[PDB]
Design a protein around this ligand. Structure first.
Ligand SMILES: Nc1ncnc2[nH]cnc12
Ligand SMILES: Nc1ncnc2[nH]cnc12
Ligand SMILES: Nc1ncnc2[nH]cnc12
Ligand SMILES: Nc1ncnc2[nH]cnc12
Ligand SMILES: Nc1ncnc2[nH]cnc12
Ligand SMILES: Nc1ncnc2[nH]cnc12
Lengths: 230, 230, 230, 230, 230, 230
C-alpha cells in the first residue's frame, strides 16, 4: 500500500492507533517486547512487538478524519487487520467528565462531510464494536480503573469560530476529538472491529488544563486497558 | 399535558414504550400486578402496574419519530419520567441477524430531519444510556437470552421507494424501525436514561416472514430482559 | 396489508382521515348509517358506513408524517382507494385566521425530510386535487359556511425549540399541523385525489385557546363540508 | 427604482408579467386602449393601457428567478402594485397535459435555492392567491376556455443535464417554466396577490413541438382569461 | 437554437457578453465596423462586427444565472463559439477596490443552486481560462490601465434580506454580481474559454455611488481591455 | 502554539508547505544554506534556512484539510507568517494533464464541509493570491519550466468509493489532492498570501504510475519555481 512500507506479515491482527507517531514509538518501546519498525514512510511510524505472547502493532495515524482514513483503509485492505484500537486524547466539554476518567466511545457525532458524501439524506451513526467495548470495560472494572462510556464529537477544525460544542454538551456529548468517526465508519464498512479509548487532555469550555503528571497516569491506564482488553 | 390524561402520581419513573397500544395492554395485563389504565386519550393506552416491588408504566407511543417525540416530551416534562425503554419490532436488513436474537441499540442512524433541524451542519449520533444498556445486557446473559448489540436505522417511511437500506446493511446496520433516534435524542437533552430493545418481525432484504411462534417467543424474551433490567 | 385488517371490498372508494381513532369512531357513529368496523389493528379504528346512499370509510391515521404515510400507502396499494380527505385540526399562526374558519389547504410547507430524501435538490410542493378542493369550496359557499383557502405547514415536531413558524406567518402561511404534506405527496404520486380540511384548535403565537363549544361547531361544519363535497 | 424608468402614477395596481418584452408590446397594443410605454431601461419594455374601465400595466420580466425577482420587488416596493399575473409559456412534462389547456398554477416546486436560503431546513411551498385563481377559473369557465389547475416546476436551467423532470411528472407535476416560485414567494411576503397562467409551448419528454397555430390560439385564450379576471 | 435567431455563420468565434441588450447595441455601434444584427428574439440583441480585421459578436445575456446559461448554452451548442468574455458591472464590497479598477474574476462564489444540483456533495469552484485572463491582464498592463485580480460573488437575489456579503468581504471577495458563476461553469463544462471583466458601479456596504463620468471612463477601459486581449 | 515548538524569530515570513515532513527535511537540506530544525512535535518537522539572501521556512503539514488547517492557523496567528506556498503531489484526472507539467492552482473545489459550515447556503470558491501566482508563473516561464494553470479538487478521502472525480474531470478540473481548499480559505480570511504548486504523481482515471525519474525531475522544477518566486 502507498503510505505504508511494511512487508507481508509484518503487521499484526490487532493494532493500536495513536495520532502522534512519537507516541507510537513511545508505546512500542515501553510496553512491547522484540520491537521492529515496519513503517517509516512520511515519518509516520508503525512498530510491531509482543505483549504477553501476543503480537501487537502500533501505527501513528496523523491528525483529522482524512489522515486516519488513509491508514485505516490501508491496514484493512492491504494487511488484513482485524482489530483497531484508537488510543488518544480529547477535550472534555462537560463539567462531569473528570481528568482521570478513561473514555470509551460508543459512538461519535461529526461535522465531517465524509458520511454525508457517502449517504446523502441519512444521518449515519458510527458504532463501536460491542465485543471490544465490553472487553475494555471489563478490564477497567477488573482493575478499578475509572471509566465513562458515551459519545464523542469528531471535529473537522481544531480551531473553530463557528464551534457548536456548546449545544453538543447539552445533549450529553462527553468530548471532542478528530478521528473517531472515520475509524468507526470504515471498520464497520469492512466487517472489522474498532474501539476508541480516550483520555482528557483539557476542559474546552473553561480553558482549564490538566497537569503533566495526571496526563502521564491516565495515559498509562489507557494503554493498559487497551492491552489487557486484547 | 395535551396527549396524556394522567393525574399526578399515576405514571411511574420507569416507562416501557411499545409502539402498539394493544401490545401495551397485553404487556400490562400479562406481567404486572395491580394495574390501572391512566390514559385513553386518542386510544393511545397507558397503564401502571407493579413488578417485583417496583412501579412500571407501559405507554403506547404510536408509529414514527413525531408521534413518539410527543409522548416522550410529555412523559419527561410533565411527569418527570427518569427511565424510558422502548420495546418493539424492527426489520432485519442483514443475513447474520437471526430471528431469535434480541437487539440492544447502542445508537441509531436516521433519515429524519429532526436533528439536522436542531444542529445545522452536524451529524448528531444519538446514544443509549450505557447503564441501562449494560443492565439489560447482564440480565440477558443471566438467563442466556440471545442478544445482539449494535445500531439501527430510524426511517420516516415504512415504504421507502428510493431506499438506502442496501448501503446501511453494508455498514453493519442491523435493522430498521421508526422511533429510536427520537427516543435517544430527547432523553439525552433532558438528562434522562433511554434504551431501545428490539425483536425481528421479518427480513426486509429477502421479504420473508417470521412465524407466529418465533415472534411471541422472542417477544417474551424481550419483555423479561427489560423488566429484569430495572 | 400489514397495519390494516380489512377484507377485500370492506373499504370504500372515498375515505375520511382523522388523526384520532376515537374521532373516527365518533364520526362513523354520528353521521354514518349501517356502520361496520373493518380495522382494529393497533386500536387504529377504520369504519365503513353509508351517507345518503354512498359508502364512506373513516380511518384514524395517527400523528405525524410517518404514521399517516403508512395508512395512506396501504389504503392506496392494497384497497384501491380513490379519494382521501383529511379532516383535522391545526394551530393558527396568523391573527386573521378566525376560530370559526374552515380551512382548505391548497398546499403545505414542511420541515419533514421525506421529500428531500425523494428529490434531493428540488423543493417539492405538494398540491391538493383541485376537483376535491373546488367541491369542498362550493359546498361551503352553498351553505354560507365560512372558508379560507391557503397553505399550511406540516411540522415534524409538535414542541419546537427551533420553531420557525414566525417566519412562515410573514409569508402568508395560515397554520401548522402534522400530516398534510404526506397525504398530498403520496396521493399525487399514485394518481389519487387528496384534500385536507382543517379547523383551528388554537392560536399558537399568543397562546389563546378556543372554547369547547366553538370547536364542536366547527368540527360539525368540517365533516359536513367533507361529506357534502363527496 | 434601479431597473424601471417610470414616474409616479404611470404603473397600474394590476400588472401582467410575460417573460418576453416583445410579447409585452404585443399584448399592450392588441388588447388595450390608450397605451403609453413607461419603461425602456434594458429594453425590458413596460406599458400601461386601459381595459374596460381599468388600468393595466404589462411588464416584461426576463427569464429566470433572479430576473423576475428584481422586477417584482421593484413593482411591489416602489410602485405599490397589488395584483401580479404572470402570463407565459411552459414545457408540458406529462402526456395527459394537452396543448390547448390553459394552466393555472396553484403552487410551484423549484430547484432554485432562493427559498432554502431564506428558510434553512424548511421546504417552502409557494402558493397562489386563491381569489385571483378562483376569478381566473370562473372566467375560463364563463367562456368554456379549457383550463387545468395544478402545480408546476420552476427550473434554474432551461437545459438541465442531470434532469429530475422524469420524477416530477410521476408526482403529477404538469409542466416546467422558470419564474413562478419567485413570483408567488415575493407576493406572499409583501401581502399582495399573485397568480401564474401558462400555455404549453411543447412537450419536454417527447421533444415534440406545437404548431404556430395552436400556440397563438392558446395565447389568446390565456390573455382573455387574465384580463377578464380583473 | 430557440432564444437566438442567427443563421449558420453569423456568430463569430469570440463573443462579448454584456447583460443589457442596449449596451450590446451601444458597444457594437461605437467600437465595431460593418455591424449586422443577427438576433432580435426577445429584444435580446446580438450583433456581429469587425475590430481591426477580426470578427467579434456582442450579445445581451439578461440578468441572473438562468438567463445567462440559456444564451451561453446556445452560443456553445448551436453556434460553436470558442471565447466568451463577459463585460459587466459589479457592486464592490470591500473598501480597497476603487471605482477606476477594472476587475478580472479568477473565480466566483455563489448561492445559486445550479452547481449543487449538478454535484450534490462537492463545493464546485468555477475557474476562468488562464490564457484569456493573462491576455486581459497583459493588455491592461501594456497600457497602464489599473487592474485587480481576484474573486467575485454571483448572487441569486439582487435585493437580499439574508445577504451574507459581509462575511464574504472578510474572506477577500471583491464584489457581487449575477452571471459569472454560470459562464465559468458552462464554458469549462464544454471545453471553451470564458473570462469576466467587471467595473465597479457602486459600493454596496456604505451605499456610495460612483459618478456618471467615472463609469463612462471605466466602461471604455473595460471594452478596450476585452478587445485588445482578443 | 499547541503543535509547533518554535521560539520567537525562528520561523520565516515565507513558508513552504509539503505534506510529507521527510520531504521537508529533504527540501531544507538540498536547497537552503544555514538550516536549523525549529520543530519536532509529532515528528512533523519544520526547518528554516537561507535562500539567496532570504529566510525560508519549510514545514510538513500532514495529510488532509484538518491537519493542514491546524498548521496554517498556528503559522498565521502565532508566527505572523505572510506567504504560504504549498508544494506537493496530486492525482491527474484528465488525459491532457501530462506528467511533466507543474500545476499552479487558481482555485480549488472541495467535498470538505469546512466551508459549508462557515457559510451556510453559499458555495465558497477559495482563490489563490494572484501576485504569488503571477510571480510563480513568470519564474516558470523564465526557465521554460512547463506550467499549467487551472483548478484542483480537494478530497477528504484518498480512497473515495462513491467518487465524483469522473464528473469533475468533465468540468475541466485537472487533479485531486487533499489540502488546497484549507490553505486558500484560511490565508484569505487572515489577509495573507497563499498559492499551491503541484506535481503529478499518477493518473487516477487510468491507474498508471509515473516513473521514479519523472517524479524527481518534476519535483525539482516545482521547488525552483517556488523559491525563484520569492
Ligand atoms: N481541544 C480539542 N479540540 C479538538 N480535538 C482535540 N483533541 C484533543 N483536544 C482537542
Ligand atoms: N420492514 C420494516 N420497515 C420499517 N420498519 C419496520 N419495523 C418492522 N419491520 C419494518
Ligand atoms: N400547535 C400545534 N402544533 C402542531 N400541530 C398541531 N396540530 C394542532 N395543533 C398543533
Ligand atoms: N422545455 C422547457 N424547459 C424549461 N422552461 C420551458 N418553458 C417552456 N418550455 C420550457
Ligand atoms: N449591488 C449589486 N448587487 C448584485 N449584483 C449587482 N450587479 C451590479 N451591482 C450589483
Ligand atoms: N490519487 C490520489 N487521490 C487523492 N490524493 C492524491 N494525491 C496524489 N494522488 C492522489
Amino acid at each position: 500500500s502507498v503510505h505504508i512500507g511494511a512487508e507481508k506479515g509484518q503487521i499484526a491482527d490487532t493494532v493500536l492507533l495513536p495520532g502522534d507517531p512519537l507516541r507510537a514509538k513511545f508505546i512500542a518501546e515501553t510496553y512491547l517486547e522484540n520491537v521492529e519498525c515496519y513503517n517509516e514512510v512520511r515519518g509516520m511510524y508503525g512498530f510491531t512487538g509482543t505483549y504477553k505472547g501476543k503480537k501487537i502493532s502500533v501505527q501513528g495515524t496523523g491528525m483529522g478524519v482524512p489522515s486516519i482514513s488513509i491508514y485505516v483503509n490501508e491496514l484493512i485492505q492491504s494487511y488484513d487487520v482485524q482489530n483497531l484500537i484508537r488510543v488518544g486524547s480529547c477535550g472534555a466539554i462537560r463539567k462531569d467528565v473528570k481528568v482521570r476518567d478513561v473514555i470509551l466511545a460508543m459512538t461519535s457525532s461529526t461535522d465531517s462531510q465524509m458520511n454525508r458524501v457517502a449517504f446523502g439524506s441519512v444521518d449515519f451513526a458510527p458504532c463501536a464494536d460491542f465485543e471490544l467495548l465490553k472487553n475494555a470495560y471489563d478490564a477497567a472494572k477488573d482493575k478499578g480503573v475509572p471509566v465513562t462510556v458515551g459519545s464523542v464529537f469528531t471535529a473537522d477544525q481544531f480551531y473553530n469560530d463557528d464551534s457548536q460544542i456548546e449545544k453538543l454538551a447539552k445533549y450529553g456529548v462527553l468530548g471532542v476529538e478528530m478521528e473517531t468517526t472515520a475509524l468507526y465508519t470504515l471498520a464497520a464498512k469492512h466487517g472489522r472491529k474498532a474501539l476508541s479509548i480516550l483520555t482528557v487532555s483539557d476542559h474546552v469550555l473553561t480553558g482549564e488544563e490538566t497537569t503533566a503528571e495526571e496526563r502521564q497516569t491516565t495515559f498509562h491506564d489507557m494503554i493498559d486497558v487497551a492491552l489487557h482488553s486484547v
